[PDB]
Subunit: 274 residues, 4 copies
């Protein structure tokens, strides 16, 4: 084809980072996005590739991702500028055959490197691949304001957050029936937070980093963005509700169960407390 | 005429879904819109029609809508993408002569189907047709944040919500003098919630689904959007007011009555409590 | 010149109504704007004029505005659509020689008429003309959310609202040193509310209609928009502050006085209480 | 090159003022921005220069800035109009050889002058130049809503604000490890507030003017905007949290310290209280 910036994947990355920015979720360099691609996606654009792809080691060996190409956001790069200069804020990287490093085949100009949260992204892509038998292809991280605020007031427990978020918007249980995982606060950009994030991803498509943000997984950019957006929307309702003094009525456990049955999903049981 | 995407109705659907999305009311696939058309509206675009219109059964027979064409949003489709690809997110469907199903004459590509809330839409279109002698042509559903938040704190009663919303913005009583109906929480996408919604529509142009969202009816897209927007605006004022501790002063019952008289409307009497 | 839609005044009206709409201040038909023009402003566009200008009587004789041309928003017209169709949502009207009615020389198509708040607009234009010796030319009304919310919690008194708003943003006393007038709630679209609004305008460039909205006056669209925007910005800060429980510290009376002296303005003394 | 409006610096100024405006930080003329340029930046555009550059005295001699060119926003000019008319809202000024005044080489048409906050800008540019050995080139002021609201509730102390803001978003300590300085309220547009601002800038890249706004410094427009945006984002989380009643859990002192170590920064020690 022609210019890679016009491909479905770069256009998708631009739309996603732009919408998130417009959402007020990604100030400065807060936030990151990675989409797993097939060699066939990037092959039409061979002539756009760097002739001397820079090689970068991975924090730790990730053999299951060996030879896998991804389009990712850069380290210290603003979601806001992606639309202005895709190549400087986005990069297509390909993990080597041992899953010990990757080559930047396109983008990330001016010596830019992938997001410092790559361990969380790649390790999670790994688990989601196994959890969904290869369906999930996107890991998205954003600093969703209301979800962040809620982590300072709600008990930081998967059951608690899952249940309250399900209560904050009817469709939530249907969009993320597996619930929302939550980690204790951890130093970001480390293999440790990445591994802890991947662990939650074995079950949850959404994972919260208290006082920091949210991680989401999905089969497409649209579905992954929509997943986070649904959770942040519910979080937004909850913040207003808690600000008005709390709930006087809410969706009941039995209603939540009837909802799950109707849409054919199996909701995280431990969140059906009360 | 030329391309149907450029018609007044597709352009209207794009503007409406776009504005709502920009309002933060329709994350993911949350929300739906249906506009009743005349055969004469779509006739200029016969060449844009599908040659093998897919036929889909209705949840239940709706004889009064027999042979009626509508432009609707799709199931699992994002209001945000309508502007990007009208045909994939919008569909023109025509109810068959028995009102037992409909043919997708245009749009809803990739085997997409109309919103799973079609029962609520179509059944409500039915009642609104009878209630307004054919004037209403639009049923719109959106997840208006503040109205949703208010359903967890305000008593879920038509009189209560109508009165508080009328108090939250002066023009409210004039825009929806018939008040705001409210249902108990129910499983969405069912014939039951649809029928319950239609029942409220016999009188109210606005109906709330607690912990879920709002339904509105109107003669045009602009008026229907404006109706919901007016209710959500008042809801927004109320949330701030309740968050500041509550009202110290407000529009009085007598003032509300003087307002109704001045604009020649008969306000829902049961909401003129106090 | 060429098409009147491209004139400085129609372009200004489009920019102003658009920015306000984007501010979330003018849902549906909530809000209105009128700009006083000179015959010389509209003369270049004679060929754009209606050949059979519709004549409309005024609610009451306004002789000082005799022969004065204005560009106004229409009744039931949405600020949101002005940019889409200026002529259908905007109209240039000219008051007759007795100030007993006006001719619609351009716009307000489809038999549209000026805003039902014209009495408040025109009567206020009258007082502002006298108060500023002809400098003010714009009267703008919008449903500024936070200012509306504050009218349910703050004592509805000019001194109270002026003082709190001055405290909510440092530049406020400098932008509206004459303070903010406030009326008791009144039926909108009446000669009575219009006259009451004009009365406040003899001194205040900003006037609040409790549970309804705000009126502002200024020499240009930019200054008038900026005035309201400054007041709504301060109101927004106050709502957050009151929502967090109230102020622990604030700008003091002496600081407010030093501020007035520094910028050479005489702040409304009755608001320098405490 | 060609037209100066298309240069990297004017385009940068337009993007920055536009994004801020869209953020709701710069209503009316609230806010200002100055970027230090090299003669080499403006030399390609000599033909765009004013032939009779107006000379304006400085509030006080600033010898270290002698012969330095800057692009600044104008006094009483709206950030919103920069994109519409760069030359009328922006000006390139050059300080004379004694640092006693400056010539307006381009822009600031219609006899416009630089922001009345120029003393705060220039004096701060001075300190930041010394503090960063010439790396910082931008001083930005904006009326960030949430940060303003917080100044009425949080103790106006550098340690307090720094600590709470670091707690309100994980990356904060990493983006501004030197903390946030805060001044007592002072009359704006004076040499006194400017000098007090510069003093804080010797250490802090962010300085708060209680009940007024925020000042930020940085090497580029993007980094400076991002810095303020990160602080306002954290402030936004805090306002929601305080509105919900306060924090139940938060980032701990030890976690904040581990965070600083991991990213190789030395966080303001006096903010690591508790
Ligand atoms: Zn962040
Ligand atoms: Zn992050
Ligand atoms: Zn190859
Ligand atoms: Zn929703
Ligand atoms: Zn819904
Ligand atoms: Zn036909
Ligand atoms: Zn309104
Ligand atoms: Zn109004
Ligand atoms: Zn003439
Ligand atoms: Zn301000
Ligand atoms: Zn300022
Ligand atoms: Zn030269």
């Amino acid at each position: 084809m022609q210019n890679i910036t016009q491909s479905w994947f770069v256009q998708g990355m631009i739309k996603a980072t732009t919408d998130a920015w417009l959402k007020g979720w990604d100030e400065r360099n807060g936030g990151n996005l990675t989409l797993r691609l097939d060699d066939a996606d990037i092959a039409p654009y061979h002539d756009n590739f760097h002739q001397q792809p820079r090689y970068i080691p991975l924090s730790q060996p990730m053999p299951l991702l060996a030879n896998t190409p991804f389009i990712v956001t850069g380290s210290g790069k603003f979601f806001r500028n992606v639309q202005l200069d895709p190549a400087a804020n986005l990069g297509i990287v390909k993990v080597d055959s041992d899953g010990a490093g990757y080559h930047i085949l396109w983008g990330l100009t001016n010596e830019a490197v992938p997001t410092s949260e790559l361990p969380a992204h790649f390790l999670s892509h790994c688990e989601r691949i196994k959890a969904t038998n290869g369906k999930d292809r996107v890991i998205m991280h954003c600093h969703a304001t209301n979800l962040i605020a809620l982590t300072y007031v709600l008990e930081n427990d998967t059951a608690v957050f899952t249940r309250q978020l399900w209560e904050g918007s009817t469709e939530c249980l249907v969009v993320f029936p597996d619930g929302v995982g939550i980690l204790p606060w951890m130093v970001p950009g480390t293999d440790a937070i990445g591994q802890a994030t991947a662990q939650e991803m074995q079950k949850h498509s959404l994972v919260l980093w208290p006082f920091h943000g949210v991680f989401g997984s999905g089969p497409t950019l649209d579905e992954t963005f929509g997943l986070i957006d649904t959770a942040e929307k519910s979080a937004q309702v909850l913040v207003k509700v808690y600000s008005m003094g709390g709930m006087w009525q809410t969706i009941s456990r039995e209603e939540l169960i009837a909802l799950g049955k109707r849409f054919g999903v199996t909701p995280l049981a431990s969140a059906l407390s009360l």
